[PDB]
Design a protein around this ligand. Structure first.
Ligand SMILES: Nc1nc2c(ncn2[C@@H]2O[C@H](COP(=O)(O)OP(=O)(O)NP(=O)(O)O)[C@@H](O)[C@H]2O)c(=O)[nH]1
Ligand SMILES: [Mg+2]
Length: 171
């Protein structure tokens, strides 16, 4: 053993939950404490489809094998920036590198008070069909929703980032 190294770079607007996504996945605990930019990258040794992989995860302020573009499901402004900023920025460096679109803070999309404070701003959470359509719009290989807090959807984000590298499409 013998494992494949895969580099994954995580981008998206400020406060969408990139750091908490990576820490929750790699330590299995949502961080209830301050996180100094001491760490800009995290690591996980994972088995996907019977294949041992060293997943290297690179965090940013909001050569990759795969990118995660993240937006908060309760921030329409972060969602618009997926196509306005993050997709063009990734594609200038890397025309072909797969992208996974990730909607974060899934626990808040059905949260009553987060729905109610948005409604004061004539905003509403991003729905699953809207996210899926934005993924098609930016040519993302997959669209996934997750909560770092509850860990719902969290493992699948990384499993899919890995499958995107290990199993590229025909062509
Ligand atoms: N309810 C909920 N809050 C979350 C979740 N993930 C992160 N948060 C909260 O969202 C805020 C931002 O999280 P953080 O991971 O620091 O975001 P970031 O994208 O790294 N920010 P930056 O780009 O500035 O470094 C924090 O208050 C954090 O607790 C989640 O899944 N659910
Ligand atoms: Mg951060």
């Amino acid at each position: 053993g013998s494992m494949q190294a895969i580099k994954c770079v995580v981008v998206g607007d400020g406060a969408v939950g990139k750091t908490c996504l990576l820490i929750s996945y790699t330590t299995n605990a949502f961080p209830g404490e301050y996180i100094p930019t001491v760490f800009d990258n995290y690591s996980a040794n994972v088995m996907v489809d019977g294949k041992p992989v060293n997943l290297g995860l690179w965090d940013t302020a909001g050569i990759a094998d795969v990118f995660l573009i993240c937006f908060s499901l309760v921030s329409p402004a972060s969602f618009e920036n997926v196509r306005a900023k993050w997709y063009p920025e990734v594609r200038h460096h890397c025309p072909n590198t797969p992208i996974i679109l990730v909607g974060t803070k899934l626990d808040l999309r059905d949260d009553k008070d987060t729905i109610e404070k948005l409604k004061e701003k004539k905003l509403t959470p991003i729905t699953y069909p809207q996210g899926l359509a934005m993924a098609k719009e930016i040519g993302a290989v997959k669209y996934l929703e997750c909560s770092a807090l509850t860990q719902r959807g969290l493992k699948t984000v990384f499993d899919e980032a890995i499958r995107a590298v290990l199993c590229p499409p025909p062509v």
